Homo-oligomer: A and B are copies of this chain.
């Protein structure tokens, strides 16, 4: 049971789903188009040891970022070359965390899957790493995990990067995501790293 344009528009109209900011032009037949924020995270450790707290760097782009596939083997020279040639603000290799501009709130009877736009998929750019499931009760922005798999990709601030596909629950959740004490990522105001060391 998937929400259509009118269901989305009506659930928003009714304040039952929150989407801040909202643009009705981004409502498609059965999904809401979300946009890429200007804040990104890259991690800094040799390995991800999930028992530990992770070191990372935050960047804020002005207009654009070049995302290279892992093992592109970026030298300082290559970075400067790409910045000069393509006028991008940052060049990164492998995984970068991003965020939607949109802050969302889901009722205990709606769920969402975040999925990338096919336009991005068609250039081998992914925006979640087998994740994108948004629980009933969730409140926050959505953290994107971005990897290029063919060639470097230029992504622009505020571009449409993916889509929320909402679905009705059979029965509502007893305790929605944001009501749980265990929840790591509620009230997510920006791009947020992994907190798995809290398990």
Contact = CB atoms under 8 A, between A and B. Distances in A.
Interface of A: 1-7, 28-31, 43, 45-51, 54, 66, 69-71, 82, 86, 94-95, 97, 108-109, 111, 115-133, 135-137, 143, 145, 147, 149-156, 159-160, 162-163, 165, 167-177, 180, 184-185, 192-196, 199
How many protomers of this protein does the assembly include? 3
Contacts of A170: 1-4, 7, 168
Contacts of A47: 66, 82, 86, 151-154
Nearest to A162: B130
Contacts of A120: 50, 129-131, 194, 196
A174 B160 CA distance: 22
Contacts of A174: 4-6
Given A6-B173, A171-B6, A122 B115 contact: no
| Residue of A116, A170, A175 contacting most chain B CB atoms (<10 Å) | A170
Contact of A175 (B29, B116, B180): B29
Given A2-B170, A170-B1, A51 B154 contact: yes
A111 B2 CA distance: 8
Contact of A169 (B3, B82, B152, B194): B3
